[PDB]
A paper describes a structure:
Hence, acknowledging the fact that linker geometry could play an important role in defining the ternary complex arrangement, we developed a PROTAC, WH244, in which we replaced the flexible alkyl chain of 753b with a more rigid 1,4-dimethylpiperazine. We reasoned that a rigid linker would maintain the overall tertiary arrangement of the complex as 753b to efficiently degrade BCL-xL and BCL-236. Furthermore, another improvement was made wherein the morpholine group in the BCL-xL/BCL-2 warhead was replaced with a one-carbon bridged morpholine (1R, 4R −2 oxa-5-azabicyclo 2.2.1 heptane), with the intention of decreasing lipophilicity. WH244 in the BCL-2WH244 ternary complex structure adopts what resembles a “horseshoe” conformation with the linker forming the base of the horseshoe and the VHL and BCL-2 ligands forming the sides. This organization results in the α3 helix of BCL-2 being positioned in proximity to VHL. A cluster of salt bridges and hydrogen bonds are observed at the ternary complex interface centered around the carbonyl oxygen of the amide moiety of the WH244 linker proximal to the VHL ligand. Here, N67 of VHL participates in hydrogen bonds with both the carbonyl oxygen of the WH244 linker and the side chain of R110 of BCL-2, which also forms a salt bridge with D92 of VHL. Further reinforcing this interface, R69 of VHL forms a salt bridge with E114 of BCL-2 which also interacts with the amino-moiety of piperazine linker of WH244. Comparison of the BCL-2WH244 ternary complex to the BCL-xL753b and BCL-2753b complexes reveals that the orientation of BCL-2 in BCL-2WH244 is completely changed relative to that of BCL-2 in the BCL-2753b structure and instead resembles that of BCL-xL in the BCL-xL753b structure.
Author numbering:
A (entry chain D): 8 to 31, 87 to 203
B (entry chain C): 17 to 46, 58 to 112
C (entry chain A): 60 to 208
D (entry chain B): 1 to 105
Write the structure that this text describes.
């Protein structure tokens, strides 16, 4: 029942802010505070994987659509749980920061579009049948 | 060259002197040795380990499991702890 | 920081885990922090082809009693880089246990741990049954041997 | 191909090894060097049948699979007694006690 566009907009804005790059159905402020804390906690627990994806990425204007569609597919291939959604969000921040490192900043708008479309199409079904975002913040808080 | 290990029930076991030195306690006693507390069924197994150890140590051959019957384990354990092998 | 650990080299190395022992072999990999991690076991007499990386550390124990096993006639195994498309062989062979330790193995398997004291044995041997072969204990011993080197 | 043996007579047991190609007379000479008894004054048996000096250890039934170090094969020994020879007599080993109840699954 929450706008999935604001959730991904406010998240990539925070991931690009931690690197100092800046950027451009109600939504409560609590779902944003939990998603940032969970993504940072996820990154700390799997720092060996965070540096792994940041190196093996190799982002180009054409493989960017190839990398996103292949990684997100392999990420949810077993199923959909809240821990994999946090990894899904964190993977979006990885491909956005790595895009602006190689000075491909316009890809942030394309990645934010791909994340919003995948949430509304392939993940909106599971999130509703699990209490929504208000249940996700209760598992972490 | 051989030695004679004698069990508590009078059985005499003749093994090669090289194999008997696997037990450091047997080496200090050296000829013949009398074990007043190791019966024949236990001392015969100890001699079988001597021939087993000498053949398979420092060998790339596939090493088989050394069998030990359940009814002989406690006695063979005490016999091995004294012999240091 | 730890002494015995695997180097994150990320260089693939093909290994063959050949179980040349009557025991069910448990492969043990030492991660990049020296912690031992368990891997799928091997039935007696079987062999499996393994994806590993160069510069990693492997142990092999009995899956039921953690008894020490020799891999290529030693305790540790380090996969080197392959050549001519041949996998590096890791022959897991049974060691020549001392007659005492082999006796300790049979008694531990037959007598339950809470019944080691009800055995009419010496009090010293009672403490030898309770000292099960432990992987963390062998790591501390195999680390001090590298320091003496 | 090496076989591992247990030459036994009365309360004596000899632990030795030999090749399957080695003859029985050669095994008797091994007993000779140990017990100081000539091979002609010896009668070697397998189970219950008397072995001839011409046959090899393999031809009698001693193979590396049935004569391992951890479980050697038993050979009977008989010493010449006055004008005739010896009736085979191998005194058995001791009997271990009964299994304590802290061992039966």
């Amino acid at each position: 029942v929450y706008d999935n566009r604001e959730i991904v907009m406010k998240y990539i804005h925070y991931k690009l802010s931690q690197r100092g790059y800046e950027w451009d159905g109600p939504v409560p402020p609590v779902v944003h505070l939990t998603l940032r804390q969970a993504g940072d906690d996820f990154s700390r627990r799997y720092r060996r994987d965070f540096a792994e994806m940041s190196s093996q990425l190799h982002l180009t204007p054409f493989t960017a659509r190839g990398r996103f569609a292949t990684v997100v597919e392999e990420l949810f291939r077993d199923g959909v749980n809240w821990g994999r959604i946090v990894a899904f969000f964190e993977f979006g921040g990885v491909m956005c920061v790595e895009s602006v490192n190689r000075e491909m900043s316009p890809l942030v708008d394309n990645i934010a579009l791909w994340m919003t479309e995948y949430l509304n199409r392939h993940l909106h079904t599971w999130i509703q049948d699990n209490g929504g975002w208000d249940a996700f913040v209760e598992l972490y808080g | 060259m051989y030695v004679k290990l004698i069990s508590s029930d009078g059985h005499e076991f003749i093994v090669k002197r090289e194999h008997a030195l696997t037990s450091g306690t047997i080496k200090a006693m050296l000829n013949e040795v009398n074990f007043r507390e190791i019966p024949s069924h236990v001392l015969s197994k100890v001699c079988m380990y001597f021939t087993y150890k000498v053949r398979y140590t420092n060998s790339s051959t596939e090493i088989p499991e050394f069998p030990i019957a359940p009814e002989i384990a406690l006695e063979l354990l005490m016999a091995a702890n004294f012999l240091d092998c | 920081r730890p002494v015995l650990r695997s180097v994150n080299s990320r260089e693939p190395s093909q290994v063959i885990f050949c179980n040349r022992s009557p025991r069910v072999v448990l492969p043990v990999w030492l991660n990049f922090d020296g912690e031992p991690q368990p891997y799928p076991t091997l039935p007696p007499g079987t062999g499996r082809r393994i994806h590993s990386y160069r510069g990693h550390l492997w142990l092999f124990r009995d899956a039921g009693t953690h008894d020490g096993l020799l891999v290529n006639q030693t305790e540790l195994f380090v996969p080197s880089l392959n050549v001519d498309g041949q996998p590096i062989f890791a022959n897991i062979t049974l060691p020549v246990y001392t007659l005492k330790e082999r006796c300790l193995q049979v008694v531990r398997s037959l007598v339950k741990p809470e019944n080691y004291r009800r055995l009419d044995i010496v009090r010293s041997l009672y403490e030898d049954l309770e000292d099960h072969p432990n992987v963390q204990k062998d790591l501390e011993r195999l680390t001090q041997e590298r320091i003496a080197h | 191909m090496d076989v591992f043996l247990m030459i036994r007579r009365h309360k004596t047991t000899i632990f030795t090894d030999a090749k399957e190609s080695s003859t029985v007379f050669e095994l008797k000479r091994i007993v000779e060097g140990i017990l100081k008894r000539p091979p002609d004054e010896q009668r070697l048996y397998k189970d219950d049948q008397l072995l001839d000096d011409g046959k090899t250890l393999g031809e009698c039934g001693f193979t590396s699979q049935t004569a391992r170090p951890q479980a050697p094969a038993t050979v009977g020994l008989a010493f010449r007694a006055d004008d005739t020879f010896e009736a085979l007599c191998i005194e058995p080993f001791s009997s271990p006690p009964e299994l304590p109840d802290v061992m039966k699954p």
